[PDB]
C-alpha cells in the first residue's frame, strides 16, 4: 500500500510527471506568447 512512500525520492519517471512538466511548459509558453500582444 504505502510502498510508494517508503523512502520517497523525487525521481519523476513514472507516467504522470513525464507528461505534466511538459504540458505545463506549454501553457507557460502560451500565457507568455499568447499574452505578448494582449498587453
Amino acid at each position: 500500500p504505502r510502498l510508494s512512500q517508503y523512502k520517497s525520492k523525487y525521481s519523476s519517471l513514472e507516467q504522470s510527471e513525464r507528461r505534466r512538466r511538459l504540458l505545463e511548459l506549454q501553457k507557460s509558453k502560451r500565457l507568455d506568447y499568447v499574452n505578448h500582444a494582449r498587453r
Binding site: 500500500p1 504505502r2 510502498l3 512512500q5 517508503y6 523512502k7 520517497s8 525520492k9 523525487y10 525521481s11 519523476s12 519517471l13 513525464r18 507528461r19 511538459l22 504540458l23 511548459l25 506549454q26 509558453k29 502560451r30 500565457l31 506568447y33 499568447v34 499574452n35 500582444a37 494582449r38 498587453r39
Partner: protein, 873 residues
C-alpha cells in the same frame, strides 16, 4: 449437444476444444439471451450437476451483467433491464436457490446475485433481494455456507453498487452484516465474510453511524472482532477501524481511549506481520486525517469561521507510545530485500515519516535518543534503524532544530556509505539525498561538498539498492547547488554554481552507471538516465563543456537504437530495446531545452531524422509509444522558424497521432504538439485544423474515453487562432456547446472524485475564447469585426464565468484564465461590458480572489484585469 457438456468443456486444457465451447456459448447467448440465462441459472441451482458445470454456468451469468470496464459494465446492465420480467424473475429465482447449495469453496451465485442486483437495485426491481439476503443469514437453521455465501453476495453488492443507491437499504443490509460478526457466531468463515462485508458497506452507513445507539452497537461488535482467535477476522476488523477513522473521525472521541488506543497499539506489537501492518497502517492513516484537518483548519480560521470538521490530535497524544514501537520495528529488517515487498519494518519507517510531518517538531525529541544509541551500534539491524529513523524526521520540524543536528550528523553519514552492511549503505544514500533535498544549506557546507561529492562518485558503481539512491542523492545535490548559487543574485542559470567545479567527472560517470550490466535491478539504469537529465537542468552556463559532449553521447546512443527497431525481433526486442530509447526521449528533452540556439540546430536535424526514420517502421508496430512526439514538441520550442525542413513527414504521422481514439492517453501528446506548432510557423497552419475538428470532437463518440480528457481538445484551438483563419468563427458555435454542457451536467461533487476534475473543462474553453478574440483582432483593427458579434452568448460567457465563481470550488487555474478573459474581452470593446460585469455579483468575488494570491503570477491577471474594467463610468 448438451449444455452441461459444453460448460464442462470450457475448462479443458485443450485449446481448440476450449475455443469451441466459448463459441457455442456465445451463439446461444446471441440467438436468445433470456432463455440462455434461464437455462444457465437452472444448471446453477441444481446440486446434481458436477461442480464444474455449475461454476461455468455461474461464470457466464456473471459476465453478462458486469465487467471491469465501466462503460461495458453500464451497457450489460441496460441489456438486463431490457429483458422482460418473466425471464428475469426466473433467473433471479435460480440464483437464490444456489445460495447454500454449493460446495465450490467460493460461491458463484454470490457474484451473480450482486451482478443482477447492481442492475435492479437503482430502479427498485428486486424487492425480494434485501429481505431474502438478510433472512438467509439471520435464520438460526441457516447452514455455514448459507450464512457465508449470502454475506459475500452483499459484499460484492456494496463494492460494485452506485454509491448513491444503497442509502434506502442501509439499515436492513447493516443488520445482516452485523449479525454475522457477533461474537456468538460459531463459524469463523461466516465471521470473516461478515466482516469483509461491513468494510464495503461503510460507504452508506452514514445515517446509521450518526445514531449513538447504533454507532456504538457497531463499534462494539467491530472491536470484539479484533479479539477473535481467527487471524483473518482480526485483520478484517482492524481494517474497518482504519476506514471508520478516516470517514467517521467525529465519533472516535468515545472510543479512542476507552478502547481503540489499546487495540491498535497492541496490534503494532503483535509479531504476526499481517496484524502489525494494520496497526501501523492505522496510525499512519490518522497522520493523514489530522494533517488534512490541520490544513482544513488553517483556512477556516483564515476565512472567519470554525472548521466543518475539527481535529483532536490523537497522533500527537499517542506519539510517545508509537515512536518506541515504530523504531523497534525498524530492527526487524529483511535480509533478502526485494523492494517489491511490504512489511512491518517498511511500514514502521513510513509511519514515523508521517508522524514527523504531522506532529511538526513534536517528534524530534522522541526520535533523537534512539539515533544516538544506534548510529554507531555494534549491530547492523539496529545501526540501520538509526540512520533510517534520522532521515525519516528530516521533513516536518523547522530548520531551527534540524540543521544543527544534520551538520554534526553529516560526517558520521559520509563514512557509513562504506559500511560492511549493504543495507546500511542503502539507507545511507537515501538519507544523504534526503538531507540535501530538504536542507541545502547544511548539505552545501564549504567543508562537506567535496567529501560528499567524493562519496556519491563511488556509490554510482555499487549495488543497485545502494547505487540507485546515489543517482537521486546527486539529483537533490544539483537541485540544491542550483539555488545556493541562484539565491542569487542573478537571473540566469549561474555561470558557476558549486558543483560546476567537479561537474565534469559526474556527467562522465553517469554514462557508465546507466550502461551497467546490472541495470534492471532496483531500477538503477532508469535512475541513471534520470539523474542525468535532472543534473542538466541544475547546471551552470560554464558547464557548457560537457553538455555538448554529453548531448552527442546521448545522440550516438539514440541513433544506434533507432535502427534495430526498423526491423524488430521478439519481445526481447520490442519494448525490450525501446526501453533505453524511451529514457533517451526524455534526456534529449532536457538537453535540447538547456543548450545554445546554435548547437540545437545540427542536432534538431539529425535528431529529427532519427525520430522519423524510426517512425516509418514503428507505426504501427506497437507504437507510437508517445515519446517521439514529446521530443518533437521540444524541437519546435527550440527552432521556431526552422521546423520548415520537416513538417511534411509530420503531416501524415502527426495526422495519425491525432486520429487514435482507442488510446486516450496517446492522442494527448499529438495535440499539444500542434500547439507548439502555432508557435513555430505561426502564419501557415490553418489547413491543419480541419483534422482536429471531426476527428477529435468525433472522439466524443462514444463516451468511453476518460474524465481527464476534454480540455486539451478545445484548449488547442485558441493557440491555432493565431493565423488569420476565418474558420475559427465556425467552431465558435461548437465551443459554446461544451462549456454549456458542463453546466447542464449535474456533476454531484458529494465525494472528492467528481470535484478533482469538475473544475477543469472550464479552464478549457477559457483558453479557447482568449485565443479566438486575439487572433481575430490585432493591436489596431481596421475591421475588428466579429468581437461583439458573439454578444448574446457573452451572457453565458460572463454568466457561466460567474457560475465558475458561483460554486465553492474552482482551482486557481480556472480562476487564472477566468481573469485573463474578462480583461482582453473588454479590450474587444467596453460596450455595456462593464454594466455586464456589474451585472452579476459573484463576478468580483472571483476577481478579488484572483487578486488574492496564491497563485503566484496567476493572480496578476485578475489584478490587472480591473484596469480596463475601471476605464468607464
Amino acid at each position: 449437444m448438451e449444455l452441461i457438456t459444453i460448460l464442462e468443456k470450457t475448462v479443458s486444457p485443450d485449446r481448440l476444444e476450449l475455443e469451441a465451447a466459448q463459441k457455442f456459448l456465445e451463439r446461444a447467448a446471441v440467438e436468445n439471451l433470456p432463455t440462455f440465462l434461464v437455462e444457465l441459472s437452472r444448471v446453477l441451482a441444481n446440486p446434481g450437476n458436477s461442480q464444474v458445470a455449475r461454476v461455468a454456468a455461474g461464470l457466464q451469468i456473471k459476465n453478462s451483467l458486469t465487467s471491469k470496464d465501466p462503460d461495458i459494465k453500464a451497457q450489460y446492465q441496460q441489456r438486463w433491464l431490457a429483458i422482460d420480467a418473466n425471464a428475469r424473475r426466473e433467473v433471479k429465482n435460480y440464483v437464490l436457490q444456489t445460495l447454500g447449495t454449493e460446495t465450490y469453496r467460493p460461491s458463484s451465485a454470490s457474484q451473480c446475485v450482486a451482478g443482477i442486483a447492481c442492475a435492479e437495485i437503482p430502479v427498485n426491481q428486486w424487492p425480494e433481494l434485501i429481505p431474502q439476503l438478510v433472512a438467509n443469514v439471520t435464520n438460526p437453521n441457516s447452514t455455514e455456507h448459507m450464512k457465508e455465501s449470502t454475506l459475500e453476495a452483499i459484499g460484492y453488492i456494496c463494492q460494485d453498487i452506485d454509491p448513491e443507491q444503497l442509502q434506502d437499504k442501509s439499515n436492513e443490509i447493516l443488520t445482516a452484516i452485523i449479525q454475522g460478526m457477533r461474537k456468538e457466531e460459531p463459524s469463523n468463515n461466516v465471521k470473516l465474510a461478515a466482516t469483509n462485508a461491513l468494510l464495503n458497506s461503510l460507504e452508506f452507513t452514514k445515517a446509521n453511524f450518526d445514531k449513538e445507539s447504533e454507532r456504538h452497537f457497531i463499534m462494539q461488535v467491530v472491536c470484539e472482532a479484533t479479539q477473535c482467535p481467527d487471524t483473518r477476522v482480526r485483520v478484517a476488523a482492524l481494517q474497518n477501524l482504519v476506514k471508520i477513522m478516516s470517514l467517521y473521525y467525529q465519533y472516535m472521541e468515545t472510543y479512542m481511549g476507552p478502547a481503540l488506543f489499546a487495540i491498535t497499539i497492541e496490534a503494532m506489537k503483535s509479531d504476526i506481520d499481517e496484524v502489525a501492518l494494520q496497526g501501523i497502517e492505522f496510525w499512519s492513516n490518522v497522520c493523514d486525517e489530522e494533517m488534512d484537518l490541520a490544513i482544513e483548519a488553517s483556512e477556516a480560521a483564515e476565512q472567519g469561521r470554525p472548521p466543518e470538521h475539527t481535529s483532536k490530535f490523537y497522533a500527537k497524544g499517542a506519539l510517545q507510545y508509537l515512536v518506541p514501537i515504530l523504531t523497534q520495528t525498524l530492527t526487524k529488517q529483511d535480509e533478502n530485500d526485494d523492494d517489491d515487498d511490504w512489511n512491518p519494518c517498511k511500514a514502521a519507517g513510513v509511519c514515523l515519516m508521517l508522524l514527523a510531518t504531522c506532529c511538526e517538531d513534536d517528534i524530534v525529541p522522541h526520535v533523537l535518543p534512539f539515533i544516538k544509541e544506534h548510529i554507531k551500534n555494534p549491530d547492523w539491524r539496529y545501526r540501520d534503524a538509526a540512520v533510517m529513523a534520522f532521515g525519516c524526521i528530516l521533513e516536518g520540524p523547522e530548520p531551527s532544530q534540524l540543521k544543527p543536528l544534520v551538520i554534526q550528523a553529516m560526517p558520521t553519514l559520509i563514512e557509513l556509505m562504506k559500511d560492511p552492511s549493504v543495507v546500511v549503505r542503502d539507507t545511507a544514500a537515501w538519507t544523504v539525498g534526503r538531507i540535501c533535498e530538504l536542507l541545502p544549506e547544511a548539505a552545501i557546507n564549504d567543508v562537506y561538498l567535496a567529501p560528499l561529492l567524493q562519496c556519491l562518485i563511488e556509490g554510482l558503481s555499487a549495488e543497485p539498492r545502494v547505487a540507485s539512491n546515489v543517482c537521486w542523492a546527486f539529483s537533490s545535490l544539483a537541485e540544491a547547488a542550483y539555488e545556493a548559487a541562484d539565491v542569487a543574485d542573478d537571473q540566469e542559470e549561474p555561470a558557476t554554481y558549486c558543483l560546476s567545479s567537479s561537474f565534469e567527472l559526474i556527467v562522465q560517470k553517469l554514462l557508465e552507471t546507466t550502461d551497467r550490466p546490472d541495470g534492471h535491478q532496483n531500477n538503477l539504469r532508469s535512475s541513471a538516465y534520470e539523474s542525468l537529465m535532472e543534473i542538466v537542468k541544475n547546471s551552470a552556463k560554464d558547464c557548457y563543456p560537457a553538455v555538448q559532449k554529453t548531448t552527442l553521447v546521448i545522440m550516438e546512443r539514440l541513433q544506434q537504437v533507432l535502427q534495430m527497431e526498423s526491423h524488430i525481433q521478439s519481445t526481447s526486442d520490442r519494448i525490450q530495446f525501446n526501453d533505453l530509447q524511451s529514457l533517451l526521449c526524455a534526456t534529449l528533452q532536457n538537453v535540447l531545452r538547456k543548450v545554445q540556439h546554435q548547437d540545437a540546430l545540427q542536432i534538431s536535424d539529425v535528431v529529427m531524422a532519427s525520430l522519423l526514420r524510426m517512425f516509418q517502421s514503428t507505426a504501427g508496430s506497437g507504437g507510437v509509444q508517445e515519446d517521439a512526439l514529446m521530443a518533437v514538441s521540444t524541437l519546435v520550442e527550440v527552432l521556431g522558424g526552422e521546423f520548415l525542413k520537416y513538417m511534411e513527414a509530420f503531416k501524415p504521422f502527426l495526422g495519425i497521432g491525432l486520429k487514435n481514439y482507442a488510446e486516450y492517453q496517446v492522442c494527448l501528446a499529438a495535440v499539444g504538439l500542434v500547439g507548439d506548432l502555432c508557435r513555430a510557423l505561426q502564419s501557415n497552419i490553418i489547413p491543419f485544423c480541419d483534422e482536429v475538428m471531426q476527428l477529435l470532437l468525433e472522439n466524443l463518440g462514444n463516451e468511453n474515453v476518460h474524465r481527464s480528457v476534454k480540455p486539451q481538445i478545445l484548449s488547442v484551438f485558441g493557440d491555432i487562432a493565431l493565423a488569420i483563419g476565418g474558420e475559427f468563427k465556425k467552431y465558435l458555435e461548437v465551443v459554446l456547446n461544451t462549456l454549456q454542457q458542463a453546466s447542464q451536467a449535474q456533476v454531484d461533487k458529494s465525494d472528492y472524485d467528481m470535484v478533482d476534475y469538475l473544475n477543469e473543462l472550464r479552464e478549457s474553453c477559457l483558453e479557447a475564447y482568449t485565443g479566438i478574440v486575439q487572433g481575430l483582432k490585432g493591436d489596431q483593427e481596421n475591421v475588428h469585426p466579429d468581437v461583439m458579434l458573439v454578444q448574446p452568448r457573452v451572457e453565458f460567457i460572463l454568466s457561466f464565468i460567474d457560475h465558475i465563481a458561483g460554486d465553492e470550488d474552482h482551482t486557481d487555474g480556472v480562476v487564472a484564465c477566468a481573469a485573463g478573459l474578462i480583461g482582453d474581452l473588454c479590450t474587444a470593446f467596453g460596450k455595456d461590458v462593464l454594466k455586464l460585469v456589474e451585472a452579476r455579483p459573484m463576478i468580483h468575488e472571483l476577481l478579488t480572489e484572483g487578486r488574492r494570491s496564491k497563485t503566484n503570477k496567476a493572480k496578476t491577471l485578475a489584478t490587472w484585469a480591473t484596469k480596463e474594467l475601471r476605464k468607464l463610468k
